[PDB]
Amino acid sequence: PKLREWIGQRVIKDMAAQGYQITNKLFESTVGVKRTDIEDDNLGVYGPLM
Amino acid sequence: IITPALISALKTSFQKHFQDALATAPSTYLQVATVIPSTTASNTYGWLGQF
């Protein structure tokens, strides 16, 4: 858009009837624990992991 | 001349000395190592094999 000069006329916005179709997506991740170190009380792990 | 108080004072002085020394110790393992605390009989930690 830009300031337009009078010539005895009017100019409406130009662009119309168009799109881009971004088509948003999704992402994910997952981690495990192995259920073993819980008994050993080695809970020091999984702090820096998270 | 020699009393347990002097020994305790020397112990505290040495404690402060090497505590200050260790607090300023250069760190190089943290660049390529991961710190993991443990409490007792820690031999398995199953974050491996997960990518």
Author numbering:
A (entry chain L): 54 to 103
B (entry chain a): 3 to 53
Could you share sentences copied from the article?
The heads of tailed phages assemble as procapsids. The sample of JBD30 used for the collection of electron micrographs contained a fraction of procapsids, which enabled their structure determination. The procapsid of JBD30 has thicker walls and is more spherical than the mature capsid. The hexamers, built from the major capsid proteins, in the procapsid are compressed and skewed, as was observed in the procapsids of other phages. The diameter of the procapsid is 556 Å, which is 6.8% smaller than the diameter of the mature capsid (596 Å). Pores along the central axes of the pentamers (15 Å diameter) and hexamers (13 Å diameter) are wide enough to enable the escape of scaffolding proteins from the procapsid. No decoration proteins are present at the procapsid surface, since the binding sites for the minor capsid proteins are not formed because the arrangement of major capsid proteins differs from that of the mature head. The expansion of the procapsid into a mature capsid is enabled by conformational changes to the major capsid protein. During capsid maturation the N-terminal arm (residues 6–25), which is an α-helix in the procapsid, extends, unfolds, and rotates ~40° anti-clockwise.
Bacteriophage Casadabanvirus JBD30, from the order Caudoviricetes, is a temperate phage that infects the bacterium Pseudomonas aeruginosa. The virion of bacteriophage JBD30 is composed of an icosahedral capsid, long flexible non-contractile tail, and a baseplate. Using its baseplate, JBD30 attaches to Pseudomonas aeruginosa via the bacterial type IV pilus, whose subsequent retraction brings the phage to the bacterial cell surface.
